[PDB]
């Protein structure tokens, strides 16, 4: 897999060189290139943003700049990913489907986002996805791209979770549930399913 991340904060993608994503890169399973968007600006101040049409707070990322960068990096085979709070929710099923892609391109936005026409134009020659990682506001798309890349890479390198325990058997007056010490696989699997189900009912009823 080839991954290209376009941003004005290249340093923010450095966690990808570490741990599991770093091993996937080093071993040759993933080619990861991080690009500073300012390398496609032709002005003296290297401007990437400009004032919104119709007014409003904040700035908008210029389409010509984004368009130039995407022209050089993408192909018709590219899956262009635009992290945004306006997108569809990223899920494990999305991570799973993205492991079948040959070339992922993450267009990380800053300010109030990227000019909508960058996406309309890109969609003329490639598949484009506007994706959110969850119902919260981030200052930019880089940390969301780390999350999305890590989820994909962990699958490449290969109900709510119940409680887990390890040694000691007793710690600060807290005992590991006796069932885990029973030596009975079937009783353990049934107990793990029940506790996983109770946690799901309590914390995520939408998952049941």
Ligand X SMILES: CCN(Cc1ccc(CNC(=O)c2csc3nc[nH]c(=O)c23)cc1)C1CCCCC1
Q: Which residues are annotated as a binding site for S-adenosyl-L-methionine?
A: 109, 133-138
Instruction: Give the side-chain half-sphere CA count within 13 A for 10.
Output: 9
The one segment of 30-38, 72-80, 99-107, 140-148 that binds a copy of itself by CB under 8 A: 140-148
Q: Which does 172 bind (CB under 5 to 8 A by kind): ligand X, a copy of itself, none?
A: a copy of itself
Among 167, 186, 205, 208, interactor with a copy of itself by CB under 8 A: 167
Among 102, 134, 193, 201, interactor with a copy of itself by CB under 8 A: 134
The one segment of 7-15, 35-43, 73-81, 99-107 that binds a copy of itself by CB under 8 A: 7-15
- What does the chain come to in residues? 208
With CA atoms as reference, report the closest residue to 61 among 73, 72, 44, 46. Answer: 46
Return the DSSP state at 123: T
Are 1 and 31 contacting, i.e. CB atoms less than 8 angstroms apart?
Answer: yes
Q: Which residues contact 63 (CB under 8 A, 6 or more apart)?
A: 114, 115, 117, 118, 121
Tokens of 132: 């959110």
110, β-bridge pairs: none
Tokens of 168: 């000691």
Among 137, 174, 186, 207, interactor with ligand X by CB under 6 A: 137
Q: Applying CB under 8 A, does 126 fall inside the site for a copy of itself? A: no
Q: Applying CB under 6 A, does 161 fall inside the site for ligand X? A: yes
Q: Applying CB under 6 A, does 83 fall inside the site for ligand X? A: yes
Binding site for ligand X (CB under 6 A): 83-85, 109, 112-113, 132-134, 136-138, 140-141, 144, 161
């Amino acid at each position: 897999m080839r991954i290209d991340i376009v941003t004005i904060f290249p340093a923010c993608l450095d966690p990808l060189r570490q741990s599991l994503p770093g091993k996937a890169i080093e071993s040759g399973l993933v080619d990861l290139n991080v690009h500073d968007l300012r390398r496609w600006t032709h002005d003296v101040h290297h401007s990437v943003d400009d004032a919104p049409y119709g007014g409003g707070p904040g700035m908008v990322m210029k389409a010509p700049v984004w368009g130039e960068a995407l022209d050089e990096i993408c192909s018709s085979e590219t899956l262009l990913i635009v992290p945004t709070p306006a997108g569809v929710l990223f899920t494990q099923a999305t991570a799973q489907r993205w492991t079948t892609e040959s070339h992922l391109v993450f267009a990380c936005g800053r300010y109030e986002g990227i000019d909508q026409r960058v996406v309309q134009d890109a969609a003329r020659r490639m598949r484009v996805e506007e994706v959110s990682i969850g119902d919260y506001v981030l200052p930019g798309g880089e940390s969301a791209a780390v999350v999305m890349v890590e989820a994909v890479l962990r699958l490449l390198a290969g109900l709510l979770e119940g409680p887990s325990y390890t040694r000691p058997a007793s710690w600060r007056g807290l005992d590991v549930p006796e069932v885990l010490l029973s030596g009975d696989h079937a009783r353990i699997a049934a107990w793990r399913r029940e506790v996983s189900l109770q946690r799901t009912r309590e914390r995520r009823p939408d998952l049941s």
